[model samples]
Target: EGFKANLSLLRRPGEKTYTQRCRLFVGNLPADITEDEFKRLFAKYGEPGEVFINKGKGFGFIKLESRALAEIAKAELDDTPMRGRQLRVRFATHAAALSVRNLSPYVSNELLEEAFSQFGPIERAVVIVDDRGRSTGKGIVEFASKPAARKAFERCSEGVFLLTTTPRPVIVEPLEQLDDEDGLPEKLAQKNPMYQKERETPPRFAQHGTFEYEYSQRWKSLDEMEKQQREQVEKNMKDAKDKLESEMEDAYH
Candidate 1:
């Protein structure tokens, strides 16, 4: 959490000291793991005073008996393998990681940096994708320092928020159906990653662009489906040719 008073290196008020004291951050855990296993896992290294597994983010925190013991845990487990990948251990920096519940499936690190990086430089902003390269619309944005992440959360939302090319809000199931009116403020909008892109495209519904962006995506898939069937028809036709060859060989045999 190398931070700054005004974008140079300085101290963040109290969180660093507090978390570094007795708590150690588990930066990697098996995707399928739960808190029940986390308790037992780190307990072997030190007394598990408390444990929290944020399975949503696939990382969590644990506090030990004391700072020195936590240090020991970090030293020993920094690269220990749990399920298949190695575990990375470190001190926790609060408010350095932000999440999205309804990010557009189009989200890429491109959108993360374009949108969230306005507050400050971000270390990494990656969208969660499945093995097939499909985004889950849930993702992580890690800032260079805790204060920058703090700034992003203060300005971004959802209860609704968005990350899309045509300027939009998405659903990965929105229950509240909240209005998109209270989005990022005007000053922020001028520098908003999406807002800049919107200027080049047409303005959208009620100051929220999802309606157009949704159908813009529709045209994309429509073309893709048409192409798939065209190519598939050719392949299936060739298979029928082979089937007739076998049929003649089997006749009266």
Candidate 2:
């Protein structure tokens, strides 16, 4: 019975294991790159089951349907330049690697595990600590399966923080293995033009500014001055009325 069951577990005549560990780590991507672009780049090798890109960090992972296709993609695309950056392609060491950063120094390991475990079973969660044993505001979390990790990645990609002390949003990405001499890859940082222009514009309190800011300031000042003038007029009328009433009483007496 055991031998027959083992034989049955083997792949059928035309079956293939698409859910196996066939992921690749892709790095040095452009800041504006999207998942569709990444997939289209490697789709020629084979259709990837999933592609996850971290636009902020400028890197991501791709999971192909089979290990053979993943290897082919790495071989073909490694060192290929795109948008002024050379691509770095390699086989992912972990089934699912998550890099969690912008954590509070006071954030505990238990808190990290608890927050991430809701999406999937954690293989390991290690918060990088300094020599003094304090958190370095960064950590790596590994999940048991690709789907599980992908779900967590999608949910937390926008950044979430457990502590209020962590003012900036937390950044989460798939961790990539680096060469012994290779330092951490440089993050591609760029601000949106609209946001930059907004920052450059003067505040509403400033004298020189756009029409909106100046109008707001003038409106507020005029409203306050009108309120004060109305209050003063009301006070003067009350005082005059009181004096007239006192004089009338004196005359009657």
Candidate 3:
């Protein structure tokens, strides 16, 4: 985690706006590395507003103009060897965060907070939703502190909850933070206007070879398969019940 320091400035009492600075956590530096050396190395990326290096900590933070420059520096410099040690550069994200996946579609933000609050106070709880406003079966919860998050993880890992008639087991794991461009390919596809519009429409193969057609067809097939499986299970249960009743009647007679 990157250390944050807030600097109080002289301003009007009711001023709500504050300076926004993007800080990058750069790690795996040589213990003897100096602040000047660190700044000189990273200067090629952009004009860093501030650079703080702690020799004992063996890491430092570089405050850049914007998050975009920080992301660029991270992508280019991360894992590169510097002074016989590989550098680890990344955006400094919240430390006390957990990712919960395989959530029930009906799970709400309120329910998520309630479930996690048993272990500790949650700073934030969010369920990822699609353009059509449907749950993506994933969410993130941030606790007030790292210890609280760890306790929740220890207790709730693979915890089971019944959001519907069927019980669903949730997978709780540490949330992985990525820069904006880190996973752009997957995100870009989801954000595409055409893709969003297609997902909103009912499943239909209007055009045989298009992405919309393929997605709709696949969804339709899966829906049909699940319906068939459900019907088969119901039929099997009914047949077994009837057979048992008939056997009981025969024995009584």
Candidate 4:
């Protein structure tokens, strides 16, 4: 009753600042943790601003308060036992936000290089296409540096419109960070099935190639179903021909 002046009193602001940023690319975590659990657990090290978990990808980012605490956390908790295995932590890069416009609908690697190369030497350019080789319309163009990308966005974004069947002004801006883990680009989340070779193979429906010789030849009768059917049909025709030949011979006699 002494301290309780009003229940609706505004809370005092803490010393946390937006500039105090440190990224931890974490791996090998306990699979059962929730967002609240993550915040509570990481609060021991520093005030965690943002927590991103990629459950499908089996990785996440934890932004701590400062570089000092980040380094300390790296030393103390980087390889510390969480569920069972050691968790690996490392510094991560801010994926460059970019804008692109005036792109051809049928933009290929070749097209990307041809158009964007004049701005700077092309490190890598990809216009995302579907499995059937259809363009997704929107694509990502990355420059070697941030400055080059900024220049490109400034000079040739919306003003320089793409010439397609549907003539429309091309829109460009910094790509927004998708909060949903599933929003990760297909390229990043492409799982190599080869890595799971030790595990059981998934059931497959469609298969390729001629499967004529795949059956076992060991079972003389069991495996000879097709061959036996063919032989029987041929024998019936041969017997019929022999009967007609005998009849013709008797007539001559």
TM-score of each: 0.32, 0.35, 0.40, 0.34
lDDT of 3 by residue, 152-221 (tens): 8887764564344445667789999776745556477887778878777786437998887888899999
Compose the digit string of candidate 1's lDDT tens values, residues 30-116. 778888788777755444655778886778888665455566778888889988879878766534666655677777867766777
What C-alpha lDDT do the candidate models reach, one value each?
0.65, 0.74, 0.74, 0.59
Off-target runs (Cα >4 Å) in candidate 4 are: 1-94, 97-102, 158-170, 179-253
Q: In candidate 3, which residue ranges exceed 4 Å CA deviation? A: 1-90, 158-166, 179-253
**Pairing residues by index, what is the TM-score of model 1?**
0.32
lDDT of predicted model 2: 0.74
Could you tally the backbone clashes for each prediction? Answer: 1, 0, 0, 0
Q: Judged by TM-score, which candidate is best?
A: 3
> Sorted by lDDT, highest first, which candidate order results?
3, 2, 1, 4
The lDDT leader among the candidates is 3
Residue-level error in angstroms, candidate 4, position 99: 4.2
Backbone-clash count (model 3): 0
How good is model 3 by TM-score?
0.40
